[PDB]
């Protein structure tokens with residue numbers, strides 16, 4: 001297996017997200033949502049909140065374990081490896097974003113790393129705050145790169161329908177959508 005940097009994604013976006021129109025834009029949402037859904041599927045967290053922000057960016061927040069906050073080789077945080085080395089969802093989204101923030105809560109601490117310009121770290125993984133020990137999760141916010149996509153307008157109805165489906169397949173997990181551009185909001189939850 002040959003590892004690559006994020007320029008490989010930026011040079012062939014369609015190989016990773018299919019297209020660079022609205023279909024491809026929304027694939028970015030699906031990759032991050034799927035990581036939250038995978039964590040919920042393993043039993044960590046019972047809500048996944050998606051927000052379309054006024055500035056055009058998109059947030060997905062889970063209440064799972066939190067991504068690991070330790071170091072890889074050479075003092076590089078694990079999180080930075082996940083987001084900056086292509087082996088895949090997190091790194092592909094980072095590559096195709098003009099900026100991305102990951103915020104992790106676990107062990108009584110809140111950490112954040114920020115990337116800009118297609119995934120270049122502008123900070124390390126730094127502790128920015130504290131939280132109760134019981135609090136855990138990951139929050140990813142990303143601004144899709146307007147120089148790559150022909151549209152950067154997230155579609156509330158499109159995300160809504162996908163989250164509803166995902167909620168039906170997961171069971172016993174709340175998926176919520178808020179649009180800060182229009183104030184629209186909906187929640188989905190299916191018991192079994």
Ligand SMILES: CCNC(=O)Nc1cc(-c2nc(C(F)(F)F)cs2)c(-c2cncc(C(=O)O)c2)cn1
Nearest residue numbers: 035036039060061062064065066067068138139140
């Ligand atoms: C809003 C997006 N939400 C979101 O990415 N949540 C998330 C991702 C991971 C990921 N971790 C990794 C890596 F690489 F660290 F394992 C990749 S994704 C974990 C996690 C936490 N502990 C252990 C594991 C594991 O699989 O062993 C996985 C928890 N929440």
